[PDB]
Design a protein around this nucleic acid. Sequence first.
DNA 1: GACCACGGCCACA
DNA 2: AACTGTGGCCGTGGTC
Length: 756
Amino acid sequence: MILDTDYITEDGKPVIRIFKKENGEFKIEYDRTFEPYFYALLKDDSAIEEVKKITAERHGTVVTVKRVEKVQKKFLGRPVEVWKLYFTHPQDQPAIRDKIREHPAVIDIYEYDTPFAKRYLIDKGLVPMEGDEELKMLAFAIATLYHEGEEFAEGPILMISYADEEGARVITWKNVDLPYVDVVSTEREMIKRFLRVVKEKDPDVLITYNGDNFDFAYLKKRCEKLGINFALGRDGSEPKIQRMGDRFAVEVKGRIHFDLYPVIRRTINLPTYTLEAVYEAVFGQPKEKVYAEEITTAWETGENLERVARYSMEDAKVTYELGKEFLPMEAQLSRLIGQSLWDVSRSSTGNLVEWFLLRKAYERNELAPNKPDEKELARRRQKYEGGYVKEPERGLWENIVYLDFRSLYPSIIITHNVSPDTLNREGCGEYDVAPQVGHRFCKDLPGFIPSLLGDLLEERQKIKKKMKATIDPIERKLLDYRQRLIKILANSVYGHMGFENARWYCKECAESVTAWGREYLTMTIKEIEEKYGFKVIYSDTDGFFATIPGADAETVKKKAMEFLKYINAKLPGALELEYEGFYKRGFFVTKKKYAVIDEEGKITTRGLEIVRRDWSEIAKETQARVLEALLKDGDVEKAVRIVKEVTEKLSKYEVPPEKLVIHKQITRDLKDYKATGPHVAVAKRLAARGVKIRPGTVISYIVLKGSGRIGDRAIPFDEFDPTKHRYDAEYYIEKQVLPAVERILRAFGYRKEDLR
DNA sequence: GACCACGGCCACA
DNA sequence: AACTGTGGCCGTGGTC
Ligand SMILES: [Mg+2]
Ligand SMILES: [Mg+2]
């Protein structure tokens, strides 16, 4: 199994290293034959002898063009005559590439910014994280003595905790009577203990939580102070820091540094993303938090150090459990993209797509288009139309069905050969025209993108058959992971075509897919209403809720499957409407805001305040109890009782302040904000106090009793004292609880005045 | 000063 | 999952 690849420099020549895991042993493969290269397009092939001799400087060393080679490749379906430029070292490219482009005899250069180690995986056709081998893992966390106002890593690291299959342990340099604590003389010997432990276990994966921005940075500062060779790498190297935009990421050569924070933040939606909140949301168990003000006091006074050691032990223990949950999914995603788990776990969906396309474009001799320049990106700022959004028939409905399409946009791309290499191609025989936009796509040859989506969805169906026959839950869970990720990948390729900074950007291909989706959707809602007498209540892009007015439950499920047979014979090719599920009742408030309940009792809410993080828990809890009384029993009397009970408890200040916290995220620097809302007002006051507010910080404020602007009365929930503070019960009643529940109860004539 | 567009956030698919 | 795109909603300051 391939873990990752990089390259070292031996006598000036590049040597690819392939970190592998075979037969339960860590191996390293060396390759001294791979040569860096990028392509160039010239006005006249005679200029190759002039373009052979451009030189540039690098580290005071003149860079040369090693050799040239003529090749025929496919640039958007069309064969082109492109020249291949070879170089001695990868870093020779960024020094000479701009001078080659500025040569008058050239038109453009292609595939010049591709990293060497990633280029090796693509050209050699190697796929990481492939195989049956099991990886040995180890999570770790640290604890530091924190004082305000001091520099970063000014205080020493007090405890280092690690956890794996054998359990969790804590290394510390003060005596603590606990069975999992290993005591040490000093901090330096505490650190040196951790290196020896990591070296002995020899883990393939090191699991952290926000270790890209803190743990490795803190250990790096201390190791330089105490003169420690932090040789965590399998080759004796030290942790390497890479820049990830406004942040950093840490590498450990030979191993995989799996930071859970970027993986968890994108795979889950929570109000706060503290390690305690993530653990309780995933495993349903409370994890106790001990703040740095408690760590420092307990350490400097030497009192109650077991309570802090238990927090350190649990940190690494829950980090290991979260690691075993999110890594198999991300490992299969790495096998699909064809890149290392380190890069995949920290990359945007767009970059993952361009990695998949670049690997696929290499297998088909397809020259990759370059990233758009500044001026081209300006011409790509035109907005196109999305999917059909029907204004829902407001109110409560009974006995309904939802019928969706099986992968709407990938099916449209496959069926109609939607691709930038097929758009308006002169001289074909079979054309397909898109509605409204009128774009034509040749079909004599399968397009580049429809071939990939066709190959992907074919594999996905093959995986599902292999999945249901698999007996061991392990591969069944992994096959389920792969067949899942394939669906998201195929749908993500469509969005790539509409992205301004995409290599395979095609606005015409994008809007044509949405135009076809609107046609096929509006036709089925028209067929199901005129032929079978259904009533489409709500529709969004690729599905709709419908029923026959005043019909019986089995009669709905009967004629619904009749309509499915009729519409699937009329749908062309890969397009397919399917039966998703039946639900007894369902309330529809507005666009992208509804809630249904099946015959089993499970309620699925969409878009309502229940699923939003910027709403108080008291308002989300009340709206849920109201929906449970209606969707399950239809007892509107129980719902109006619930609301009046909550408001009275709020009016008497008897509701816990924890349920009244509002969580809003900061997205930019506080100077960029042109409108200062409540969560920005409290953040600016905080920054004046000294605390750093970073883009992405989650603010948790509470509104206090008073008058005027809300921002002038909102304090962070850190500073709320029940003996000293009283929240604005008037605000939470009339601006949170009542507005949220009244949108539903207004369907029964109940006004907010009747809800108090 | 009631009325309103509007940043700003997050959600649906 | 969500770069593509479509919407609901609120606290806030601008308006005449
Ligand atoms: Mg290129
Ligand atoms: Mg890398």
